[PDB]
């Protein structure tokens, strides 16, 4: 067949086809987006006191806010 004619080209098409297809089916792409989003470059600014939100915690030790944990939890 084609494996004996030009083998390195067929190997390149195969690894290229898995490079196209394979990033869809993966258990790690949503993890990639979370890791990439949750790194703060600029300053997380404070904001005005109350619209009586059950969010936006007043202390950086208070666990009432959205934090990351899956860095340490593999």
């Amino acid at each position: 067949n084609v494996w004996a004619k030009e083998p390195v080209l067929v190997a390149s098409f195969a690894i290229a086809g898995l490079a196209v297809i394979l990033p869809t089916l993966s258990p790690y792409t949503k993890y990639s987006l979370m890791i990439n989003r949750a790194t703060p470059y600029n300053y997380p600014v404070p904001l005005r006191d109350d619209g009586n939100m059950p969010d936006v915690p007043s202390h950086p030790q208070d666990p009432q806010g959205p934090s990351l944990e899956w860095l340490k939890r593999l």
């Binding site: 470059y41 600029n42 300053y43 600014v45």
Partner: protein, 71 residues
């Protein structure tokens, strides 16, 4: 009399035709001069909806907390 009866038109018919036709084209001439005066003042001052060349659309101007405090 037969020639005037079977072929021609009354002076009433033609006379009222002339009068109606002058009414029509007097409206046309007055609208045309008013058009060019509106156009010249609207180009001069710019208050009207015709000559408005598109400036910046401000919807893309998105104020937000930046990196540097003094913007």
């Amino acid at each position: 009399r037969w020639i005037a009866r079977t072929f021609f038109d009354a002076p009433e018919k033609n006379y009222e035709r002339t009068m109606a036709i002058l009414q029509i084209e007097s409206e046309k001439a007055e609208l045309r001069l008013k058009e060019l005066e509106v156009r010249r003042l609207m180009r001069a001052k710019g208050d009207g909806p015709w000559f408005q060349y598109p400036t910046i659309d401000k919807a893309l101007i998105d104020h937000s907390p930046k990196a540097t405090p003094d913007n």
